[PDB]
């Protein structure tokens, strides 16, 4: 059958929590005032190493390995910047007004003006972090939201008659993660009305996270033509998947 549809709510939380990739470090040197092109190199180098952990994290997500290789490639190509962004927003939650790209790389809004076009995307990331802070987002809810982004950001972008069965199994996992979130909120002493409201508030942020990824993805393609960022072979194949 499948290993995801058999997991319970608490076992779902355990698996996702156990699957969490580590928080990588950056080669940032505070003694060197990094310019726009150098600050881009740090984020490109960091995101390149994060993709490798994300790819192996997606394997640990329940149900993801129960899909074809072409489906796995599709979902990640569509959601990689979304998953990076929501991870960044999560790490920055207790650093108001700053984005914790790495434990040694904490950036300010003014430092985002360094790179041209980054200001608007920095402000959206900051506001998303502000939203998680107001909601007091729990880690068990974050890991659910992150694996939802993985299965949802490419499920309507496939489809033939044979591949239609794969679409239905993804929603069965999606519905399972939705039960898990509700299980979490009920455990935290929330009424039914409160659980439905918070469940909606979380999934609406995913609309904004998609907006940031899209606007961000559009910005990444321009710099490839601008040729200001250093080298990154996997990010080029990921960026061209949206082109």
């Amino acid at each position: 059958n499948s290993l995801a549809l058999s997991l319970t709510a608490d076992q779902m939380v355990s698996a996702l929590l156990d699957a969490e990739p580590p928080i990588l470090y950056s080669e940032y040197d505070p003694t060197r005032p990094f310019s726009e092109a150098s600050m881009m190199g740090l984020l490109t180098n960091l995101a390149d190493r994060e993709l490798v952990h994300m790819i192996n994290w997606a394997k640990r997500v329940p149900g993801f390995v129960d899909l074809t290789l072409h489906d796995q490639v599709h979902l990640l190509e569509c959601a990689w910047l979304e998953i990076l962004m929501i991870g960044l927003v999560w790490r920055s939650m207790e650093h108001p007004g700053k984005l914790l790209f790495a434990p040694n790389l904490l950036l300010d809004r003014n430092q985002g003006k360094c790179v041209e076009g980054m200001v608007e995307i920095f402000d959206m990331l900051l506001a998303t972090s502000s939203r998680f802070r107001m909601m007091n987002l729990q880690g068990e809810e974050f890991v659910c939201l992150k694996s939802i982004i993985l299965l949802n950001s490419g499920v309507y972008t496939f489809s033939t008659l044979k591949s239609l069965e794969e679409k239905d199994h993804i929603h069965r996992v999606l519905d399972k993660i939705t039960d898990t979130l509700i299980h979490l909120m009920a455990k935290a002493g929330l009424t039914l009305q409160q659980q439905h409201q918070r469940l909606a508030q979380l999934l609406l942020i995913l609309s904004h996270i998609r907006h940031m990824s899209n606007k961000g993805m559009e910005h990444l393609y321009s710099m490839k033509c601008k040729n200001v960022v250093p080298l990154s072979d996997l990010l080029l194949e990921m960026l061209d998947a949206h082109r």
């Binding site: 490798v52 790819i55 290789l69 490639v73 194949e237």
Partner: peptide, 10 residues
Amino acid sequence: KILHRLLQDS
């Protein structure tokens, strides 16, 4: 496709 290989590793 690098994403294919990394998904197929081990």
